[PDB]
Structure 1
Amino acid sequence: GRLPACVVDCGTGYTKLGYAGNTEPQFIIPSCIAIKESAKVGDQAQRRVMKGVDDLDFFIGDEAIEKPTYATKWPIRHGIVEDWDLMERFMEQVIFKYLRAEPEDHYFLLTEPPLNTPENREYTAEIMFESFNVPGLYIAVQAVLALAASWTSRQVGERTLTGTVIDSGDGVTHVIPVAEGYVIGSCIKHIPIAGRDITYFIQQLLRDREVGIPPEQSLETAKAVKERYSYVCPDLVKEFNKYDTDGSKWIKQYTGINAISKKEFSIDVGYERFLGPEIFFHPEFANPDFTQPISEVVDEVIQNCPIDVRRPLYKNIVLSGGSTMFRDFGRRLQRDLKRTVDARLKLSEELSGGRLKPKPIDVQVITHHMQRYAVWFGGSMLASTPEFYQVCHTKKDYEEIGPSICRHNPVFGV
């Protein structure tokens, strides 16, 4: 008989492991690896050669953050794997320790961001096909699986196959318009500004103002401040004024534990309540290359799709990923989008001569019960169908053509 396919959604800040056919990932670990690192001289490809069996003395996931004598490395940066040695070791413990899957009896469904270079896919195919020897692989785009995770929380008869998926993870934020089940790939947008940029901005804010934060935790604090006291503001300068004139109400206190002497430190959370998420509607706060808000990027995405599929795309904007769990994020997004759309419609009516008043475009932003792991569940659907075993790259295909079998994805033509 057949065994369920393994689903491994490898994200920059968190990896979701499971067996296809379930409702939620069996494991959600941090995407980090603790290896023994010491003071050495020479290149990186030369000091990584470990004598004996010392290359198996490493940990991953939750067990890699606890280890205080190991060095913690993150192999994935901005969704693109920058280190393949650490990624191979991470994958081998993901398969042989957590999933406990024999990699020769299970099809694998990995994930990727839209702008993953083809050489990354070729290296992933080389790893899964020659090292782990999987009978089949399928590298699906991350946000396109997040659409089929909003159907579990919406009433019957309004579970559509058309919508704009906004996936904001730890390292990348991408916008994918799906229409009737077909990924409109030539309209996908991809911005490397995401949760971790918010965490760097927040720690730089805290470090310029607060005192008493242990250095070795200056990041771990900026996550607990970001994922707890952060919201979205309707206006920036008005919020600065609201904090200045009535600071006794808007300024909160965060009390953490210094995990060396177990003492407690206390800091004041002020402007970084609303300046964190604001790098979504002002990306220049974290990366001066991008200057375009997320509402305008979504509007460009939808306005580039075919005409008669623009009106349903506005109706089912599905959020996904952790970085979209900010209070009143969807509300401000929908407000800006409604402003843009109504202004465009009124301009078109005025240019027409003033005879017809067209239907106001319904704009809706869908928050659902599965956002934190909306991608994985989507995979758990796709990798549970029969047709799945018809779209995978069989081992024969790799043995015949080579890793170049995995070189194409729906973002580029030919």
Structure 2
Amino acid sequence: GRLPACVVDCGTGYTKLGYAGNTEPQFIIPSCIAIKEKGVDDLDFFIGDEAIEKPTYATKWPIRHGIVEDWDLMERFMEQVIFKYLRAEPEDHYFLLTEPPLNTPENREYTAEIMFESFNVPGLYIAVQAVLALAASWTSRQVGERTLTGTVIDSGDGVTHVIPVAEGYVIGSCIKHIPIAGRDITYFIQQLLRDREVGIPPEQSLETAKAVKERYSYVCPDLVKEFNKYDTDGSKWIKQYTGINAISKKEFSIDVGYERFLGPEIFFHPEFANPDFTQPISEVVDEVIQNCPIDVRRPLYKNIVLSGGSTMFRDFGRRLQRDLKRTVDARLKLSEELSKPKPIDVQVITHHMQRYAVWFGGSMLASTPEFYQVCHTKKDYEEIGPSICRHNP
């Protein structure tokens, strides 16, 4: 077809949208919608950045926990994604949308109903996020041999998942969710700042924390050694962040320190900020993989792929691989002593297309001749029914 398909990856905190074939999304906007709470009142709304601090409107987050909380809101959100941002005549474009892990057949029909009944799209494909992430990693220089068997580690804004995949098929009963994600790390960094730095505008506390997390944080190899580097040579570690006060228009600066490495550290030591969860991410991954079929266990350990904005921290992959290798090696050691399992090859894959793995993967898939074959059409919808969009070829 002359026109490229539309690719939409709705996330807990951010929605990535654009056209198939492109390497990056054309828009990455917050997954929120601002409404007023007859006539065309249903159209009086905004989404994304324009919807965050609307004076007369109330900001909503229809997907901030993983699944669609409000279909009315989601449907409207799509109206603007289509007619305001993408500017696509919906009837002329096939759409590729993504879904959260373990999405139900029912929810898929709700989405198809919206896309076919409201927007009359000619073709719809609802893709599983983890599979697209795996495909996105094929771009990596660590991976030149494409395979759809791997362990996906997707950490976004509100949710983090360890998803095992075997030959393109998710092992649903072995998935594990981790109570740590972007918001958690931001909130934590915010606390660390609350105990040290003065001058941070209350109204811009989270904001400031977010910036520190995204611009200054990283994952260190050892806490004491890092705390030491800092105390020993503060000059080469403490940074400065000069923000802008709105309701004062005055300037405000703060020192950025330990939070830089403490923030991402909660992935590895959840107890630091979470009273109910204590499992280190490396242990969660090991656990998930150990619950899967023995015959697919090594292929999983050898292809641990990252996805999501919260996996962007420098050395996240390295830290994850090392701690995971220790656990594995320690076990195989304790078994040969207690008693010859060949060494376990553990490989964590980090690649450039990591911030938007899902979207990128979906973009590459919807721009291949194949895509138009596995995509459920409006025809099959009106005749066979919505149930057709349950199986995702």
Q: What TM-score results when the alignment is normalised by the length of structure 2? A: 0.88
Query: Which stretch has the larger CA shift, 288-297 or 117-126?
Result: 117-126
Query: Which stretch has the larger CA shift, 281-290 or 107-116?
Result: 281-290
Distance, in Å, in 2 between the alignment partners of 1:78 and 1:244 is 39
Equivalenced residue count is 393
Change (3 A) 1:335 1:64: same
Change (3 A) 1:215 1:390: same
Change (3 A) 1:122 1:200: farther
Change (3 A) 1:261 1:118: farther
Deviation readout 1:249-307 (Å, 9 max, x if unpaired): 54332210113443211123233222211221123344433321111111122223332
Change (3 A) 1:35 1:215: farther
Change (3 A) 1:285 1:120: farther
Q: How far has the Cα of 1:198 moved from its partner?
A: 1.2
Deviation readout 1:353-375 (Å, 9 max, x if unpaired): xxxx5542222212111111111
Structure 2 unaligned regions, length at least 5: none
Change (3 A) 1:192 1:409: farther
Change (3 A) 1:399 1:94: same
Change (3 A) 1:238 1:170: same
**1:239 equivalent among 206, 226, 240:** 226
Distance, in Å, in 1 between the alignment partners of 2:176 and 2:384 is 31
Query: Which stretch has the larger CA shift, 92-101 or 79-88?
Result: 79-88
Q: Is the 8 A contact 1:78 1:192 kept in 2?
A: no
Paired residue for 1:382? 365
Query: Which stretch has the larger CA shift, 394-403 or 10-19?
Result: 394-403
- SS of equivalent residue, structure 2 residue 246: coil
Change (3 A) 1:399 1:316: same
Q: How far has the Cα of 1:246 moved from its partner?
A: 5.8
Change (3 A) 1:116 1:289: farther
Q: How far has the Cα of 1:205 moved from its partner?
A: 3.0
Q: Is the 8 A contact 2:159 2:177 kept in 1?
A: yes
Q: How far has the Cα of 1:92 moved from its partner?
A: 0.4
Structure 1 unaligned regions, length at least 5: 38-50
Change (3 A) 1:123 1:291: farther
Q: Is the 8 A contact 1:81 1:87 kept in 2?
A: yes
Q: CA RMSD in A?
A: 2.8
Change (3 A) 1:264 1:68: farther
Change (3 A) 1:269 1:359: same
Distance, in Å, in 2 between the alignment partners of 1:69 and 1:265 is 29
Q: How far has the Cα of 1:317 moved from its partner?
A: 1.6
Query: Which stretch has the larger CA shift, 287-296 or 330-339?
Result: 287-296
Q: Is the 8 A contact 2:289 2:301 kept in 1?
A: yes
Q: How far has the Cα of 1:67 moved from its partner?
A: 5.0
Change (3 A) 1:197 1:115: farther
Deviation readout 1:81-107 (Å, 9 max, x if unpaired): 223333222110001111122222322
Paired residue for 1:13? 13
Q: How far has the Cα of 1:248 moved from its partner?
A: 5.5
Distance, in Å, in 1 between the alignment partners of 2:372 and 2:179 is 32
Distance, in Å, in 2 between the alignment partners of 1:156 and 1:219 is 37
Q: Is the 8 A contact 1:79 1:112 kept in 2?
A: no
Q: What TM-score results when the alignment is normalised by the length of structure 1? A: 0.84
Change (3 A) 1:205 1:292: same
- SS of equivalent residue, structure 1 residue 174: strand
Identity of aligned residues (%): 100
Q: Is the 8 A contact 2:142 2:349 kept in 1?
A: no
TM alignment of 1:64-79, pairs within 5 A: 64-65=51-52, 70-79=57-66
Distance, in Å, in 2 between the alignment partners of 1:154 and 1:179 is 22
- SS of equivalent residue, structure 2 residue 219: coil
Deviation readout 1:174-206 (Å, 9 max, x if unpaired): 122233444333322223431111112222332
Q: How far has the Cα of 1:208 moved from its partner?
A: 4.1
Change (3 A) 1:133 1:289: farther
Distance, in Å, in 1 between the alignment partners of 2:326 and 2:293 is 21
Query: Which stretch has the larger CA shift, 78-87 or 151-160?
Result: 151-160
Deviation readout 1:97-146 (Å, 9 max, x if unpaired): 11122222322211122144555434323322222222332222212201
Query: Which stretch has the larger CA shift, 84-93 or 304-313?
Result: 304-313
Paired residue for 1:24? 24
Distance, in Å, in 1 between the alignment partners of 2:143 and 2:99 is 31
TM alignment of 1:48-63, pairs within 5 A: 51-63=38-50
Q: Is the 8 A contact 2:150 2:165 kept in 1?
A: yes
Q: Is the 8 A contact 2:135 2:146 kept in 1?
A: no
Change (3 A) 1:397 1:351: farther
Change (3 A) 1:161 1:121: closer
1:82 aligns with 2:69: yes
Q: Is the 8 A contact 2:140 2:350 kept in 1?
A: no
- SS of equivalent residue, structure 2 residue 262: coil
- SS of equivalent residue, structure 1 residue 319: strand
Q: Is the 8 A contact 2:190 2:209 kept in 1?
A: yes
Q: Is the 8 A contact 1:193 1:286 kept in 2?
A: no
Q: How far has the Cα of 1:332 moved from its partner?
A: 1.2
**1:263 equivalent among 233, 250, 259:** 250
Change (3 A) 1:36 1:136: same
